[model samples]
Target: GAMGAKSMWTEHKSPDGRTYYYNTETKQSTWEKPDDLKTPAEQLLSKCPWKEYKSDSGKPYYYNSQTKESRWAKPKELEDLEGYQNTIVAGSLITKSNL
Candidate 1:
């Protein structure tokens, strides 16, 4: 499946081992995680039965540690963190004739 817009922003580790995010589309970097990247499912990970784990190849997979169940794909319940379009401001016209 295709990744969401949030996926365009990737997580990176600083030389000091601090985590940061970089936007590939905008060439922007930030120390704080963008709210857009905070999917509902991601927020629930701490409280839910599903836990995320990365494979040797670096791909993410979900596992239910308590149940010993695992899957290469994200659980459907955690897949609905989509983005919202921001509102645009219109420009105002200014006219100044030779007074």
Candidate 2:
């Protein structure tokens, strides 16, 4: 009963990408309404340094310098080819290829 009075505004996000704000300690989880609408640009700009892939699986990323793996390139399988660096932008998945 005492903890019920200590409720605070707690923002939560859903699996389907919807935001809701509600009091934590007071009420059960419900479809809380939002005060203001969010723009697409505002959402993308919030998360920075985005990665190419969501999961670092079946592909090589940065090397593990702090770990036991002592190698120049990560994934250790990718050879130095005619690599082309593309300007990465945030929004949707990248489909453009250099080839």
Candidate 3:
């Protein structure tokens, strides 16, 4: 009872589409949240790479190499991103695909 479990999840999804469940921090566990338990599409819209947009001011993204995961980067700092060719302009349109 000394070592406690962490986030015993019902479901999580992996990069390879493998589903996993968990009762401890095995790290291999990748259970997906049941659809009923998931957030609305609108709420999760900003957490992915490619997304639809009505206008500018919605560009922020990074490709996570290790997991092949793409997450929305924090709102544009817009000066520069290291090693990138650079994908931003002051007061310019930045759609989800811009990055």
Candidate 4:
């Protein structure tokens, strides 16, 4: 199942004897179950080879199913595409505003 990992969220006992979930990677604690408990490693089990997914907070991630890989950082392939467009947009806006 690849369910347990250092980077994945784990159950913790609070001082008041209540249960909580803690994430090692993000160092976040929550009383409620996280909507997505799957770790980066688990994403690889999905059907898509390479695709983009967003976190609960809307952060983007790239996953590769063929390689069983996932990364919080944007893939170089996507970076080249979106980065170029962003650069052009920012450049044009700055040039027009500063002129």
Candidate 2 structure quality by residue, lDDT tens digits, 1-99? 122433355768778656667765565455633222222332332232221222224453433323534333434122211111222233233444433
The lDDT-based order of candidates, best leading, equals: 4, 1, 3, 2
Tens digits of per-residue lDDT for model 1, 1-99: 024344677899767666788889889998876656754444456456776755656788887867889888767654542111111112211222333
lDDT of 4 by residue, 1-99 (tens): 133443477888767566788887788888865546643333322323666765756687787767868898767765555555555535664356676
Candidate 2: clashing pairs of residues: none
Off by over 4 Å in 2: 1-7, 30-99
Model number with the top TM-score: 1
* Candidate 3 C-alpha lDDT tens digits along 1-99: 212533444565578655566545544444444333333342243343433332234455555434665556532322232212222233333354576
Which residue pairs of candidate 3 clash?
11-31, 11-32, 12-30, 12-31, 12-32, 20-31, 60-73
Clashing residue pairs, backbone N/CA/C < 3 A, model 4? none
**Clash number for each model:** 0, 0, 7, 0
lDDT of each: 0.60, 0.37, 0.41, 0.61
Ranking according to TM-score, highest score first: 1, 4, 2, 3
Q: Candidate 3, which segments miss by more than 4 Å at Cα?
A: 1-30, 50-99
Question: What's the CA error at residue 13 for candidate 1, in Å?
Answer: 0.6
Candidate with top lDDT is 4
